[PDB]
Design an enzyme around this catalytic site. Structure first.
Site, mmCIF file in Angstrom:
data_model
loop_
_atom_site.group_PDB
_atom_site.id
_atom_site.type_symbol
_atom_site.label_atom_id
_atom_site.label_comp_id
_atom_site.label_asym_id
_atom_site.label_seq_id
_atom_site.Cartn_x
_atom_site.Cartn_y
_atom_site.Cartn_z
ATOM 1 C CD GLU A 1 -0.304 -5.616 -1.966
ATOM 2 O OE1 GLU A 1 0.893 -5.585 -1.615
ATOM 3 O OE2 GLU A 1 -1.234 -5.333 -1.179
ATOM 4 C CG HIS B 1 2.241 -12.198 0.954
ATOM 5 N ND1 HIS B 1 1.683 -12.488 2.183
ATOM 6 C CD2 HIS B 1 2.098 -10.862 0.786
ATOM 7 C CE1 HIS B 1 1.224 -11.377 2.730
ATOM 8 N NE2 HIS B 1 1.458 -10.377 1.901
ATOM 9 C CD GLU B 2 3.786 -9.159 -2.393
ATOM 10 O OE1 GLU B 2 2.713 -8.528 -2.510
ATOM 11 O OE2 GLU B 2 4.487 -9.092 -1.369
ATOM 12 C CG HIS C 1 -1.609 -8.839 -1.587
ATOM 13 N ND1 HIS C 1 -2.604 -8.475 -0.706
ATOM 14 C CD2 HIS C 1 -0.446 -8.747 -0.895
ATOM 15 C CE1 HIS C 1 -2.070 -8.190 0.469
ATOM 16 N NE2 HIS C 1 -0.762 -8.339 0.379
ATOM 17 C CD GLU D 1 -0.809 -7.406 3.928
ATOM 18 O OE1 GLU D 1 -0.363 -8.533 3.573
ATOM 19 O OE2 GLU D 1 -0.716 -6.381 3.212
ATOM 20 C CG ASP E 1 5.337 4.443 6.453
ATOM 21 O OD1 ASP E 1 4.747 3.473 5.900
ATOM 22 O OD2 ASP E 1 5.689 5.421 5.748
ATOM 23 C CE1 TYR F 1 1.953 -7.164 7.114
ATOM 24 C CE2 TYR F 1 2.199 -8.872 5.446
ATOM 25 C CZ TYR F 1 2.278 -7.544 5.822
ATOM 26 O OH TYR F 1 2.685 -6.574 4.924
#
Ligand SMILES: N[C@@H](CCC(=O)Nc1ccc(OC[C@@H](O)c2ccccc2)cc1)C(=O)O
Ligand SMILES: [Yb+3]
Ligand SMILES: [Yb+3]
Ligand SMILES: [Yb+3]
Ligand SMILES: [Zn+2]
Length: 610
Positions: A271, A295-296, A299, A318, A375, A383
């Site tokens: 995003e 989704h993006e 954001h 999320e 990560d 989410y």
């Protein structure tokens, strides 16, 4: 009350806030370095401030300039994934609320965990190279020295020099182009971001980029040969922007451009404000993976406007974003479609919990990331556990209409700010003060801090799901005398989304008998389908069911694209299948040097090598 970001080595927000960044840099494709100056405007938050600490990761510092003079600085030793702390000594001590500009001349490592450098032969045009950034979560420090924390928000102006025949784009508004004043054959692109963002939303791309206009405030960017499919695939963008504006308030970023990256891009999307990055694996040819765009888009409010204070509270980013995403799809395709996607997400949640283990600390909604590489802990959990909570509360508080009213106010109250789970929950109680008793029925402890599946499953409409269960169950319980009744007609009234859900459901009961999977391809021809989502689940089913002929198909897909949601489990499944194990490990060793650094490190850890 005081809260510190354990993923940052930099001085915390309660000591000093970065208020602005002036970036002047040169993009060098020969050396694979980013060269230049990062001018940081810093506001002190306490009296008698003598020095501050900044985040770095594999950076070369040339000099540190404050008011035209070189000052003293010291890099501490590397603390693994966090990088190295950088203490800058200020010549004049700062009072509360006073500002100083600190100019750091820096070079990036060729191995920066923020960047991937592509050779010409790794691109589509095959004549020009490519570079892209992915700062989320804590990789901005691997581009420039900064308070690498989402608790700090800053505006930025940038000026980046690239070879004349290439285009630079940033997470900002394009300020136009002019040739370098001290130049080789180069162009110096200018950028401005007037809205205060967390530094993980700083982004840069450089390649042989061409654009096409698909909306009043939307351009698709990509290499020449992708521009066509992209323009068609994402046509619904402006209409999605319009619905998102109705849900979250006004879109404040001015422009919403899309960029379609090389296949090695590690995520569905990113995003980046003003310029959403998307994977080319979205190019299904039928707009069916457009939920990722939704989704993006979403954001631009939940995430970029109201931002998680630390990554511990990632779920705020999320959870709400998936909530708005599914509302966009719902308002576009029907409420029943919104339920179908919501149930599918519970499905994905079930999978992450089974994978991690139902007592795994990474299945908690709010995770403690002390000494955990962000990560490694990344998954669908924030989410989908995040969506489930919001969905559950929506049903509890009297429906989507009422809850979207909370959502709009929430975005409004916390715009341009960085917040914790507690701020969110406190506002929830403040907004629904007429419904406190209902809110006290929810098992807050379990939802927020307990591992595993949530203490309660929401209610899901089943219209579009039933045909998926019927068919998956038929295959899962199939015997010899059912095999001949399976037919192409089974698929006739199923959408691509339902096909995907069918495979997801069947994948949860893998392995299926080899003969059955062979029969599945015989009657459905799932090999001919290029929809990345369908192909992914299909090839997993095949590998997990011990089909040797699927080995080269799964190898092809795992390495011909880099999206970690596809690439990682494909490699894992291929490592678990004894027939493909050696080849899986060998293929990764050949491909790792030309892979994305984060993807390489993760797949390497997945496979237990190095
Ligand atoms: N934002 C993009 C995807 C890239 C991304 O989120 N990057 C990213 C990577 C690691 C992170 O780490 C924190 C994470 O490990 C975590 C997991 C569970 C709970 C809380 C935080 C967070 C974001 C999108 O949604 O389309
Ligand atoms: Yb140097
Ligand atoms: Yb150099
Ligand atoms: Yb039978
Ligand atoms: Zn997201």
């Amino acid at each position: 009350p005081e809260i510190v970001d354990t993923c940052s080595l930099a001085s915390p927000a309660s000591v000093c806030r970065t208020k602005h960044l002036h970036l002047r840099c040169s993009v060098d494709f020969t050396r694979r370095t980013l060269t230049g100056t990062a001018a940081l405007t810093v506001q002190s938050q306490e009296d008698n401030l003598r020095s501050l600490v900044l985040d770095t990761k594999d950076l070369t510092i040339e000099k540190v300039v404050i008011n035209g003079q070189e000052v003293k600085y010291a890099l501490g030793e590397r603390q693994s994934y966090k990088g190295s702390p950088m203490e800058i000594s200020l010549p004049i001590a700062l009072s509360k609320n006073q500002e100083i500009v600190i100019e750091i001349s820096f070079e990036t490592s060729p191995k920066s965990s923020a960047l991937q450098w592509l050779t010409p032969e790794q691109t589509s045009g095959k004549e020009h190279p490519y570079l892209f950034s992915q700062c989320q979560a804590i990789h901005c420090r691997a581009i420039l020295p900064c308070q690498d924390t989402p608790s700090v928000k800053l505006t930025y102006t940038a000026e980046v020099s690239v070879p004349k025949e290439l285009v630079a784009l940033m997470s900002a508004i394009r300020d136009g182009e002019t040739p370098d004043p001290e130049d080789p054959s180069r162009k110096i692109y200018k950028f401005i971001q007037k809205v205060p963002i967390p530094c993980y939303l700083i982004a840069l791309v450089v390649g042989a980029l061409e654009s096409r206009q698909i909306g009043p405030r939307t351009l698709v960017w990509s290499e020449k040969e992708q521009v066509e499919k992209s323009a068609y695939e994402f046509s619904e963008t402006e209409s999605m922007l319009k619905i998102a504006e109705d849900l979250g308030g006004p879109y404040v970023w001015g422009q919403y451009d899309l960029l379609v990256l090389p296949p090695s891009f590690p995520y569905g999307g990113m995003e980046n404000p003003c310029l959403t990055f998307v994977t080319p694996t979205l190019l299904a040819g039928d707009k069916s993976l457009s939920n990722v765009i939704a989704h993006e888009i979403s954001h631009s409010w939940t995430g970029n406007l109201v931002t998680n204070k630390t990554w511990d509270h990632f779920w705020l980013n999320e959870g709400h974003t998936v909530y708005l995403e599914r509302h966009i799809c719902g308002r576009l395709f029907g409420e029943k479609f919104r339920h179908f996607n919501a149930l599918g997400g519970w499905g994905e949640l079930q999978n992450s919990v089974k994978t991690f283990g139902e007592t795994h600390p990474f299945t908690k909604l709010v995770v403690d990331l002390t000494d955990i590489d962000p990560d490694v802990a990344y998954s669908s959990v924030p989410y989908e556990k995040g969506f489930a909570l919001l969905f559950y509360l929506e049903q509890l508080l009297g429906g989507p209409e009422i809850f979207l009213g909370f959502l709009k106010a929430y975005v409004e109250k916390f715009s341009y700010k960085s917040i914790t789970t507690d701020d969110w929950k406190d506002f929830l109680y403040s907004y629904f003060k007429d419904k406190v008793d209902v809110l006290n029925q929810v098992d807050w402890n379990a939802w927020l801090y307990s591992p595993g599946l949530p203490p309660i499953k929401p209610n899901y409409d089943m219209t579009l799901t039933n045909a998926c269960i019927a068919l998956s169950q038929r295959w899962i319980t199939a015997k010899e005398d059912d095999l001949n009744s399976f037919n192409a007609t089974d698929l006739k009234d199923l959408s691509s989304h339902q096909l995907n859900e069918f495979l997801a459901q069947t994948l949860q009961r893998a392995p299926l008998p080899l003969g059955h999977i062979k029969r599945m391809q015989e009657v459905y021809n799932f090999n001919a389908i290029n929809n990345s989502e369908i192909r992914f689940r299909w090839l997993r089913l095949c590998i997990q069911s011990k089909w040797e002929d699927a080995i080269p198909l799964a190898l092809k897909m795992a390495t011909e694209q880099g999206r970690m949601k596809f690439t990682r489990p494909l490699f894992k499944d291929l490592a678990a299948f004894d027939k493909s194990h050696d080849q899986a490990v060998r293929t990764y060793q050949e491909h790792k040097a030309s892979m994305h650094p984060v993807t390489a490190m993760l797949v390497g850890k997945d496979l237990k090598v190095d």
